[PDB]
Amino acid sequence: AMNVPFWTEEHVRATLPERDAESHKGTYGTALLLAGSDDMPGAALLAGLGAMRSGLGKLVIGTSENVIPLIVPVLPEATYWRDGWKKAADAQLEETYRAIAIGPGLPQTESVQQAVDHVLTADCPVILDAGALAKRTYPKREGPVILTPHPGEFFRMTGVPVNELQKKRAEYAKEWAAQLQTVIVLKGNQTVIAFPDGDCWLNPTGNGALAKGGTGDTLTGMILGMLCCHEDPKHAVLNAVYLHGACAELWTDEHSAHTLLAHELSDILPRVWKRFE
Amino acid sequence: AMNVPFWTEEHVRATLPERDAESHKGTYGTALLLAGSDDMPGAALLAGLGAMRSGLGKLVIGTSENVIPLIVPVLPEATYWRDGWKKAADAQLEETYRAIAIGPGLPQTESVQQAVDHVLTADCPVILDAGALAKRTYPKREGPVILTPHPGEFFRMTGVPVNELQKKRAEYAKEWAAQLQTVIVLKGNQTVIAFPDGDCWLNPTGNGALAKGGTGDTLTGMILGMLCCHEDPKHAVLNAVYLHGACAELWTDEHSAHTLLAHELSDILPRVWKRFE
Amino acid sequence: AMNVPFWTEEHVRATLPERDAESHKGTYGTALLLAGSDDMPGAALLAGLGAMRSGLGKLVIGTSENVIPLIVPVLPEATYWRDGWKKAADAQLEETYRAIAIGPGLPQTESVQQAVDHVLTADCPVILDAGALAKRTYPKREGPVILTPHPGEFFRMTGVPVNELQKKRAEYAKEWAAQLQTVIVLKGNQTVIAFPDGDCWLNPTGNGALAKGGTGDTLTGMILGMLCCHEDPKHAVLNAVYLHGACAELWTDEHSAHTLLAHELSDILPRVWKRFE
Amino acid sequence: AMNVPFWTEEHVRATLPERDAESHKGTYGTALLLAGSDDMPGAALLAGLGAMRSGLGKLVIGTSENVIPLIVPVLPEATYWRDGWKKAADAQLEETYRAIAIGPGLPQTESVQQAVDHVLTADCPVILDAGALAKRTYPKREGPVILTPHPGEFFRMTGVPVNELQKKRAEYAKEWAAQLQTVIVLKGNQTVIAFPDGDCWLNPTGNGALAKGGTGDTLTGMILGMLCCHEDPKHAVLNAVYLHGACAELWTDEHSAHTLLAHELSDILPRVWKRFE
Ligand SMILES: NC(=O)C1=CN([C@@H]2O[C@H](COP(=O)(O)OP(=O)(O)OC[C@H]3O[C@@H](n4cnc5c(N)ncnc54)[C@H](OP(=O)(O)O)[C@@H]3O)[C@@H](O)[C@H]2O)[C@@H](O)CC1
Ligand SMILES: NC(=O)C1=CN([C@@H]2O[C@H](COP(=O)(O)OP(=O)(O)OC[C@H]3O[C@@H](n4cnc5c(N)ncnc54)[C@H](OP(=O)(O)O)[C@@H]3O)[C@@H](O)[C@H]2O)[C@@H](O)CC1
Ligand SMILES: NC(=O)C1=CN([C@@H]2O[C@H](COP(=O)(O)OP(=O)(O)OC[C@H]3O[C@@H](n4cnc5c(N)ncnc54)[C@H](OP(=O)(O)O)[C@@H]3O)[C@@H](O)[C@H]2O)[C@@H](O)CC1
Ligand SMILES: NC(=O)C1=CN([C@@H]2O[C@H](COP(=O)(O)OP(=O)(O)OC[C@H]3O[C@@H](n4cnc5c(N)ncnc54)[C@H](OP(=O)(O)O)[C@@H]3O)[C@@H](O)[C@H]2O)[C@@H](O)CC1
Ligand SMILES: Nc1ncnc2c1ncn2[C@@H]1O[C@H](COP(=O)(O)O)[C@@H](O)[C@H]1O
Ligand SMILES: Nc1ncnc2c1ncn2[C@@H]1O[C@H](COP(=O)(O)O)[C@@H](O)[C@H]1O
Ligand SMILES: Nc1ncnc2c1ncn2[C@@H]1O[C@H](COP(=O)(O)O)[C@@H](O)[C@H]1O
Ligand SMILES: Nc1ncnc2c1ncn2[C@@H]1O[C@H](COP(=O)(O)O)[C@@H](O)[C@H]1O
Ligand SMILES: [Mg+2]
Ligand SMILES: [Mg+2]
Ligand SMILES: [Mg+2]
Ligand SMILES: [Mg+2]
Structure with missing residues (x-):
């Protein structure tokens, strides 16, 4: 009804970054991922793989001691801030990060909100997902x-009920992005990407292969990595959501949509992203 | 002798579900898998992979603390109910599940039977396999x-001896499905699927590649996932048994039947299932 | 000089077993693998993968508690006898196995020899490798x-020095197989397979891709599995040694011989074995 | 400005070693890798995979107890010297190694320098990377x-600032290789390989796919393995740096340069190295 435009293949191709010959890992920054807990460890692996696949320089994973060993053999490229999401509840981060994500596989607790409050004092883009999402307001900051x-x-x-929300997705997403002054990626078929300056887009990619545990955890990671390699954080969000869906569409060419596992999205992304270069 | 019909490719094609564009993981439900023990941990990974490959929305694995870490790196998409199969012996489940499986890699003990008795008070289909199979009767319930x-x-x-059973497989399976008022998937070459309402089918797929440890553990998982995405639980059982065998037949096209490992059935299913769409 | 014949492709094709449609895992037996220690855990995974790839029904791995978790995610199809190689030092095995292997990654100790002495009271073929090889004699037994x-x-x-041995490999291998009344698979380029009844063969397959840690550990497993599916244990040994080498020759078609990792031999075997069917 | 020559495909082809039919793992030596720590475990897996892929006979990994289990399932071919990098601080090595690498994922501490001092009393090539790099001098030794x-x-x-260094890379690398009497592999686009005898080369391979955490850890391992199979250690260093970059160039043919993970370099090397044979 609002005629929200789609972020199309043309927009993706025009905005994906180069990886210059004269770059090193520091060029692409160090990201922090605060994710994973004892009974939901896998979300950290899922988001970590999404992040490292998505063009960052380095990734530090702040997770519980028991989660660390479960990540390493699959994603040996990441390093760790031991019990980092718990530690983040106690103090401002002393390390500089290019971008930070918090929430996948974290319990939805006040301690996690304390960690959110500390991370927001950093000068970088911050993604909040999953257990880090609560009814709250956000401080004025640059990132x-x-x-x-x-x-x-x-x-x-x-407090907007789901049945009401789903009738007017873009309207609600835009209203609340404006009210909160945050970006809102309202997921679902035709994901809405609403910016607090009033810009809004729909995502045209993806299918029911994505309707399975873990896929949103992977997405959080993809956004985190793309924030590190895109100059414009708006493009990073839009390209992450688009390519995440495109990976599921590749899968379904030769595989049943009932059968995708989220980590395979990260495995597919290398070839999918090349198509848009 | 009873002229039991085969569940054929035509029946599979006619009954496999769609994965709608306007679905999310909740559409396909949360399954519970109660499996894996200290000296048989792998059965939990095998059944978990079968389940998550088979069209569910989410999977919770209730297994021993020592088993959890062995699953995560391979199946990061699952979450956990820590010591869940032991905990299930103590109380009705407070969580709602779409379907539940119990038994793979569980010791054949009275405590496991206590867990079975509690799970049966849930209102959902329940699969009993392996260590959860005992001489017993079953309460009237809807699922x-x-x-x-x-x-x-x-x-x-x-108490039917194996040598006698194997001479009259469908007859025994039908008789006992009726007596117990349970579905019985009597495994073997030409698996019998006997329903307590008298319907009975033979499975036409599979080969001796399946004659190796773990393959039945994978099957339990496949049934569990298919129960979550099929409207008719009869079709879910029949399609799981059929596709499980079809995966082994794909394997043997270019690989020796002596050499299959059960987890590879789950890896093959994505492409095999697409063939029947 | 003795004109020892090669075990050729023709002999392999003539002697590899069928996997019958009317078989189950029990048809192909349960093997026991006694392998792996705290600072050499990987040998257990290598031999376990070789075994389960090689046509057995079930595999029990008797290894240290600390080794078990390192196997499970890669070879979930195996089950465990916790601290089994240590426990085997104390008593005859109460379980019946189709075939047993002992030694890969085990320290070369008197306790391991005690385990060997107990395993030899079983009525099945037994493979001794690595830390289970010592200067000793062997009791009369059927297997x-x-x-x-x-x-x-x-x-x-x-006590035959290596430099002397390598000048007269088949002569020494035959002499000692006769003296000890054991099969001796004397490894190297042109592996010698010497039987205690005087039969002897050379293996024509393999290349320097095999000249790297772990490949003999994989071989022990392959022999173990093949003993379970071949009626004639002589053929099992000869086919294992042959196919092990054939896997390395496949690898080198498109990969450098410097770059093979032993576990990949097990990954290649499915396709290689099909070629000889 | 100095007209430093490139180490070209022709030089690689002329100097890569054969893997002779009449070789065994001992022919290619046992390497020691001292790497990995509790919050940077993955560097040990990365360097270990690079090493074992690169033509050694055996690899011993001296790492922390907590790191060992994270390596085994992915690289089962390696064995361990438990807490070896810490133990190396206390005494000369009693074991003979073909080549030794120290540093990836090690904290940059005086204890690590103590380990370096002990390893340098061995008679073999030694690679120092990462946490083993400090401002220091080196003893006269043969290797x-x-x-x-x-x-x-x-x-x-x-003490040469990065901005100054990067203007005159080969000049600085040559000057300091001469002053220290060490080889210096000064990384970056157009990596400089400077020998203490005055020979110097530029590497022509690689791209921004390498600008991500872990890739230098993999490289250290590749050098370690190549030192074991090349007669001339100069060629080993030059070929490792070249092939490491060539693997990234293969990747980018069909995958986006933003999406490479370092361990995949090791996975690509088998096919890339074959191209130069
Ligand atoms: N998965 C794991 O276990 C991993 C483990 N790892 C381990 O982490 C440890 C620390 O090693 P590290 O290289 O990550 O950090 P560190 O020494 O602080 O160096 C960064 C500094 O160097 C600079 N700089 C670098 N290249 C440059 C260039 N071309 N051109 C210009 N500047 C350049 C860079 O400059 P900047 O970008 O800030 O301008 C910054 O100042 C080590 O043990 C390693 O093995 C890592 O490999 C990660 C994966
Ligand atoms: N492997 C791991 O470690 C995994 C970890 N994970 C972690 O689990 C944590 C909890 O997150 P979660 O999303 O699983 O559960 P939760 O917040 O209770 O939300 C469900 C509710 O939302 C609703 N709803 C959702 N989408 C909808 C739509 N399109 N349209 C309509 N309704 C929709 C749904 O509705 P219903 O289907 O019931 O109608 C239900 O009410 C979090 O930390 C996450 O990271 C998971 O990613 C799993 C894999
Ligand atoms: N990796 C893991 O964690 C693994 C875990 N697993 C777990 O192990 C547990 C025990 O289950 P299990 O099936 O291994 O042994 P068990 O119940 O003693 O049955 C064998 C008996 O049945 C018979 N029999 C079977 N089929 C037959 C047929 N077609 N036709 C005829 N006879 C037939 C067979 O006969 P036989 O060959 O001796 O004549 C023998 O008497 C269970 O929890 C399972 O989940 C396993 O899946 C292994 C991988
Ligand atoms: N990942 C793991 O867990 C791994 C575990 N493993 C475990 O390590 C344990 C020790 O077994 P191992 O074979 O590594 O050492 P060891 O018995 O000292 O033998 C070396 C001696 O034999 C000689 N020699 C050998 N072949 C020869 C030939 N063709 N021709 C000539 N000489 C030849 C060689 O001679 P050299 O080269 O010194 O002249 C040297 O003297 C064992 O339990 C095994 O399972 C390993 O498999 C590694 C991967
Ligand atoms: N049917 C569908 N079509 C397109 N995207 C979907 C579908 N189902 C789920 N997704 C996407 O999958 C992810 C689910 O996130 P979450 O519930 O946090 O795991 C989001 O990116 C959704 O937009
Ligand atoms: N020879 C065979 N032909 C067809 N299916 C088989 C064969 N051997 C085993 N299976 C199947 O493999 C599984 C074995 O289950 P289980 O013994 O519980 O692991 C069941 O699905 C069997 O029907
Ligand atoms: N150059 C080679 N040619 C053929 N086979 C080899 C070669 N080097 C090693 N092997 C085989 O690799 C294995 C090495 O066993 P081991 O030293 O116990 O790991 C045996 O099967 C050897 O015969
Ligand atoms: N843009 C690039 N072009 C070529 N090689 C690169 C590039 N970025 C990084 N590398 C290589 O990647 C590795 C990085 O090492 P490190 O920082 O120790 O992980 C070295 O081998 C670098 O020369
Ligand atoms: Mg989510
Ligand atoms: Mg079973
Ligand atoms: Mg050996
Ligand atoms: Mg480095």
């Missing part, structure tokens, strides 16, 4: 805050 | 109970 | 004993 | 010492 709710999480954030 | 014995397990359940 | 030394291990077994 | 700094590490070693 964007990017919230990635599915409709259930949006209800938790706003 | 189907699906037993998945091989002939040795059927002897344990019924 | 074959198969020793798998490289030339260094043969020196340890016999 | 080469190979330092592998990126420009930040070179600043730490020398």
Whole structure:
């Protein structure tokens, strides 16, 4: 009804970054991922793989001691801030990060909110997902805050019931991005990407292969990595959401949509991203 | 002798579900898998991979603390109910599940039977396999109970000796499905799928590549996932057994039947299932 | 000089077993693998993968508690006898196995020899490798004993110096197979397979891709599995040694011989074995 | 400005070693890798995979107890010296190694320098990387010492600021290789390989796919393995640096340069190395 435009293949091709010959890992920054807990460890691996696949320089994973060993053999390229998401509840970060994500596989607790409050004093884009999403307001800061709710999480954030939300997705997402002054990636078929300056887009990619545990955890990681290699954080968010869906569409060419596992999205991204270069 | 019909490719094609564009993981439900023990941990990974490959929305694995870390790196998409199969012995489940499986890699003990008794008070289909199979009766409930014995397990359940059973497989399977009022998937070459309402089918797929440890553990998982995406639980059971065998037949096109490992069935299923769409 | 014949492709094709449609895992037996220690854990994974790829029904791995978790995610199809190689030092095995292997990654100790002495009271073929190879004699028993030394291990077994051995490999291997009344698989380019009844063969397959840690550990496993699916244990040994080498020759078609990792031999075997069917 | 020649495909083809039919693992030696720590475990897996892929006979990894289990499932072919990098601080090595590398994922501490001092009393090539790089001098010894700094590490070693270094890379690398009497592999686009006898080369391979955490850890391992199979250690260093870059160039043919993970370099090397045979 609002005629929200799609972020199309043409926009993706025009905005994906180069990886220059005269670059090193520092050029692409160090990201921090605060994710994973004892009974939801896998979300950290999923988001970590999404992040490292998505063009960052380095990744530090701040997770519980028991989660670390479960990541290493699959994603040996990441390093660790031991019990980092718990530690983040106690103090401002002393390390400089290019971008930070918090929430996948974290319990939805006040301690996690304390960690969010500390991370927001950093000068970098911050993504809040999953257990880091709550009903709250956000401090004025320079770097964007990017919230990635599915409709259930949006209800938790706003009190807008899911059945009402789903009738007017872009309208609600835009209204709340404006009110909160955050980016809102309202997930679902035709994901809405609403910016607090009023810009808004729909994502045209993806299918029901994505309707399975873990896929949003992977997405959070993809956004985190893309924030590190794109000059414009808006493009990073839009390209992450687009390519995430494009990976599922590649899968379904020769595989049943019932059968995708989220980590395979990260495995598919290398070839999919090349197509748009 | 009874002229039991085969569940054929035509029946599979006619009954496999769509994965709608306007779905999310909740559409396809959360399954519970109660499996894996200290000296048989791998059965939990095998059944978990089968389940998550088979069209569910989410999977919770209730297994021993020592088993959890062995699953995560391979199947990061699952979450955990820590010591869940032991905990299930103590109380009705407070969580709602779309379908539940219990038994792979569980010791054949009275505590496991206590867990079975608690899970059966849930209102969902329940699969009993392996260490959860015993000589017993089943309470009247709305959701189907699906037993998945091989002939040795059927002897344990019924007292019918294996050598006698194997001469009259469909007759025994039908008789006992009726007596117990459970589904019985009596495994073997030409697996019998006997329903307590008298319907019965033979499975036409599979080969001796399946004659190796773990393959029945994978099957239990495949049934669990298919119960979550099929409207008719009968079709879910029949399609799981069929596709499980079809995966082994794909394998043997270019690989020796002596050399299959059960987890590869789950890896093959994506492409095999696409063929029937 | 003795004109020892090669075990050729024709002999392999004539002797590889069928996997019948009317078989189950029990048809192909349960093997026991006694392997792996705290600072050499990987040998257990290598031999376990070789075994399960090679046509057995089930595999029990008797290894240290700390080794178990390192196997499971890669070879979830195996089950465990916790601290089994240590436990085997204390008593005859109460379980019936189709075939047993002992030694890969085990320290070369008197306790391991105690375990060997207990395993030899079983009525099945037994393979001794690596840390289970010592200077000793063997009791009269029905099942074959198969020793798998490289030339260094043969020196340890016999006192024949390596430089002397390597000039007259088949002569020494035959002499000592006769004296000990064991099979001896004397490894190296042109591996010698010497039977205690005087039969002897050379293996024509393999290349320097195999000249790297772990490949003999994989071989022990391959022999173990092949003993479970071949009616004639002689053929099992000969086909294992042949196919092990054939896997390296496949690898080198498109990969450098400097770059093979032993576990990949197990990954290649499915396609290689199909070629000989 | 100095007209430093490139180490070209022709030089690689002329100097890569054969893997003879009449070789065994001992022919290619046992390497020691001292790498990996609790919050940087993955560097040990990365360097270990690079090493074992690169033509050694055996690899011993001296790492922390907590790191060992994270390597085994992915690189089962390696064995361990438990807490070896810490133990190396206390005494000369009693074991003979073909080549030794120290530093990836090790904290940059005086204890690591103590380990370096002990390893240098061995008679073999030694590679120092990462946490083993410090401002120091080196004792006269027969085997080469190979330092592998990126420009930040070179600043730490020398006091030459990065912005100055990067204007005159070959000049500085040559000057300091001469002063220290070590090989210096000064990383970056157009890596400089400077020998203490005055020979110097530029590497023509690689791209921004390498500008991500872990890739230098992999390289250290590749050098370690190549030192074991090349007769001339100069060629080993030059071929490792060249092939490492060539692997990234293969990747980018069909994958985006933003998306490479370092361990995949090791996975690509088998096919890339074959191209130069
Ligand atoms: N492997 C791991 O470690 C995994 C970890 N994970 C972690 O689990 C944590 C909890 O996150 P979660 O999303 O699983 O559960 P939760 O917040 O209760 O939301 C469900 C509610 O939202 C609703 N709803 C959602 N989408 C909707 C739509 N399109 N349209 C309509 N309704 C929609 C849904 O509605 P329903 O289907 O019930 O109608 C239900 O009410 C979090 O930390 C996450 O990172 C998971 O990613 C799993 C894999
Ligand atoms: N990796 C893991 O964690 C693994 C875990 N697993 C777990 O192990 C547990 C025990 O289950 P299991 O099936 O291994 O042994 P068990 O119940 O003793 O049955 C064998 C008996 O049945 C018979 N029999 C079977 N089929 C037959 C047929 N077609 N036709 C005829 N006879 C037939 C067979 O006969 P036989 O060959 O002796 O004549 C023998 O008497 C269970 O929890 C399972 O999940 C396993 O899946 C292994 C991988
Ligand atoms: N990942 C793991 O867990 C791994 C574990 N492993 C475990 O390590 C344990 C020790 O076994 P191992 O074979 O590594 O050492 P060891 O018995 O000292 O033998 C070397 C001696 O033999 C000689 N020699 C050998 N072949 C020869 C030939 N063709 N021709 C001539 N000489 C020959 C060689 O001679 P050299 O080269 O010194 O002249 C040297 O003297 C064992 O339990 C094994 O399973 C390994 O498999 C590694 C991967
Ligand atoms: N998965 C794991 O276990 C991993 C483990 N690892 C381990 O981490 C440890 C620390 O090593 P590290 O290289 O990450 O950090 P560090 O020494 O602080 O160097 C950065 C400094 O150097 C500079 N700089 C570098 N290149 C440059 C260039 N071309 N041109 C210009 N400047 C350049 C850079 O400059 P900047 O970008 O800031 O301008 C910054 O100042 C080590 O043990 C390693 O093995 C890592 O490999 C990660 C994966
Ligand atoms: N049917 C669908 N079509 C397109 N995208 C979907 C579909 N189902 C799920 N997704 C995407 O999958 C992810 C689910 O996130 P979450 O529930 O946090 O795991 C989001 O990126 C969704 O937009
Ligand atoms: N020879 C065979 N032909 C067809 N299916 C088989 C064969 N051997 C085993 N299977 C199947 O493999 C599984 C074995 O289950 P289980 O013994 O519980 O692991 C069941 O699905 C069997 O029907
Ligand atoms: N150059 C080679 N040619 C053929 N086979 C080889 C070669 N080097 C090693 N092997 C085989 O690799 C294995 C090495 O065993 P081991 O030393 O116990 O790991 C044996 O099967 C050897 O016969
Ligand atoms: N843009 C680039 N072009 C070529 N090689 C690169 C590039 N960025 C990084 N590398 C290589 O990647 C490795 C980085 O090492 P390090 O920082 O120790 O992980 C070295 O081998 C670098 O020369
Ligand atoms: Mg989510
Ligand atoms: Mg079973
Ligand atoms: Mg050996
Ligand atoms: Mg480095």
